[PDB]
Design a protein around this ligand. Structure first.
Ligand SMILES: *[C@]1(*)CC[C@@](C)(CC)CC1
Ligand SMILES: *[C@]1(*)CC[C@@](C)(CC)CC1
Ligand SMILES: CCO[P@@](C)(=O)OC
Ligand SMILES: CCO[P@@](C)(=O)OC
Ligand SMILES: [Zn+2]
Ligand SMILES: [Zn+2]
Ligand SMILES: [Zn+2]
Ligand SMILES: [Zn+2]
Lengths: 330, 330
């Protein structure tokens, strides 16, 4: 009956409106400590993130899930500072994304499971902050090491009840292999969110996952390079489907009976060093509402398309609570 | 007339007997902070490193050059602690090795040059400790990003006078391309050590580098898996040439007139997470003298083969001082 945040345990009812896939800073391990000037300064990144989380809170957000791992350069003391200053709860992550270093890539399934358990059960670094979610990734067929990560994540979730959330190449149907691996370890689909699932329009894929009990992460709604066809790096990252096209998948899955399994977010960030220089500027130009885009723009859009207020509340409040609530089955 | 160490500037004469390619811990950025139990504990790694540096100092070592970068998980506060406790000077490194994360790999030559300059001229992280060498790497033909790193390293050296030291796949003759890149930027060969050069027996390659003025890093003398043919991972890392075979390259280059350009070391470490589990144990079994192997075993070997005491002192004391001494030409 409690979820770990960067400021400690909170009750389920305190989570409130929750964005389930967000980042304070998308970086690399040690990078913000070694090269803070890349972001202007650490203080500038903090100020930017607080301003943004304050705008989100004013729009109705109460909690974000920062799904930055070790290899995304998660800095839990930065998250704690931002969380305190903005009065928005932040749930931190363990796991590994797509850029693990050699010291992680050479590890066994057992060793990885120890590491993820450490961050859930003991703490991150020497901070005593415990993760409330496990983040994993593939981009196409899993590498051998990613198979180990997905298995370790399953083990860590089976021991603790903390959920797993994934990065996919959704157009490659990665969620099918991720599911297979997780199920081979015994993990309940109700403890797993298959993320970046709004990157595809393939309903045969989305419903195959939802029918087995997976949560479906429609988590990049404002990601679009429409109107930036000249910028190859922004097109490659963001794609050329509209935010409306992505948002309508929320309606599609509601219409198929999966309202309880949908998790919505922006996949936004306040700093971004793991891609091209100045990408954060480009992104901010596309979506000046930042993390507030879901409540300010997506919710009203969906209401105008005939989705109910009650259904939207269930998606933004009930589903994240049920997901984040530690349990073996949800 | 001063070299930066983890405890501040020292005079040239204070450097004394210097090992020019060593590691306290071979790891990954953030790893020791996130997963100290991999090493037993941080305190255990500190104790091990102090014991080892004390044994080296008793054998005549006064300074080591820790050529661990950002991506080797260099922890300058760990180096400072070990340096204080063992009374051995440690020179820290900037640059990038073979495992840079996305936040580094996406950067330009200019950006990289700023980062290396930061670590030389201002400090590492928030510690105020400044690097005294720039470390770079290729394993075969340079990737596009490694070309940028080598160019940035050249720029940073041209601005500050701090030398560059390299990781090679010596059997692939990487030093030839590294030289070409460095020279394309204007860098003097006398400011560059082409490292892991004892990994090859190709004198046509070694002398081609030394003839242009490069320092030659014969830096892995005790690395050998002879008598561990059953251990594939140790054979792959350490090779199947004897330490004597490697040591005799020091004599070969003396005999060709290059005594002033030879730099000798062990390429040892006290923790090693970026390879197979328990590799440190295997390595310690092969060479229980650790960093003391050069003075305890290599120097007497070379004397018995007819190299002079004076020549060996010039190699272990004069050459490292001339190399580390900030200058545009040495
Ligand atoms: C919230 C209420 C249920 C519907 C109308 C689906 C029948 C969706 C909106
Ligand atoms: C140190 C003195 C010079 C030699 C003998 C090379 C002639 C090497 C040893
Ligand atoms: C830090 C970037 O992480 P993603 C994979 O969600 O893409 C923006
Ligand atoms: C940390 C390991 O670095 P290398 C390339 O000198 O090999 C042991
Ligand atoms: Zn992702
Ligand atoms: Zn993300
Ligand atoms: Zn090396
Ligand atoms: Zn090395």
């Amino acid at each position: 009956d409690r979820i770990n945040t960067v400021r400690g345990p909170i009750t389920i009812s305190e989570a409130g409106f929750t964005l389930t896939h967000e980042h304070i800073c998308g970086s690399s391990a040690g990078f913000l400590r070694a090269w803070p000037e890349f972001f202007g300064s650490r203080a500038a990144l903090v100020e930017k993130a607080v301003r943004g989380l304050r705008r989100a809170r004013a729009a109705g957000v109460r909690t974000i899930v920062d799904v930055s791992t070790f290899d995304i350069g998660r800095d839990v003391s930065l998250l704690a500072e931002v969380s305190r200053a903005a009065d928005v709860h932040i749930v931190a992550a363990t796991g590994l994304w797509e850029d693990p270093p050699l010291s992680m890539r050479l590890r066994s399934v057992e060793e990885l499971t120890q590491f993820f358990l450490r961050e859930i059960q003991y703490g991150i670094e020497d901070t005593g902050i415990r993760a409330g979610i496990i983040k994993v990734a593939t981009n196409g067929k899993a590498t051998p090491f990613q198979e180990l990560v997905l298995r370790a994540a399953a083990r860590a979730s089976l021991a603790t009840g903390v959920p797993v959330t994934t990065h996919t190449a959704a157009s490659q149907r990665d969620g099918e292999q991720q599911a297979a691996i997780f199920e081979s370890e015994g993990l309940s689909p109700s403890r797993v969110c298959i993320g970046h699932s709004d990157d595809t329009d393939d309903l045969s894929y989305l419903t195959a996952l939802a029918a087995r009990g997976y949560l479906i992460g429609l988590d990049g709604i404002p990601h679009s390079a429409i109107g930036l066809e000249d910028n190859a790096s922004a097109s490659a990252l963001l794609g050329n489907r509209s935010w409306q096209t992505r948002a309508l998948l929320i309606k599609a899955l509601i219409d198929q009976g999966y309202m309880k399994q949908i998790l919505v977010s922006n996949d936004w960030l306040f700093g971004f060093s793991s891609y091209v220089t100045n990408i954060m500027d480009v992104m901010d130009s596309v979506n000046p509402d930042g993390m507030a885009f879901i409540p300010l723009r997506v919710i009203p859009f969906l209401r105008e398309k005939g989705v109910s207020q009650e259904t939207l509340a269930g998606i933004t409040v009930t589903n994240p609570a049920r997901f984040l609530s530690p349990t073996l089955r949800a």
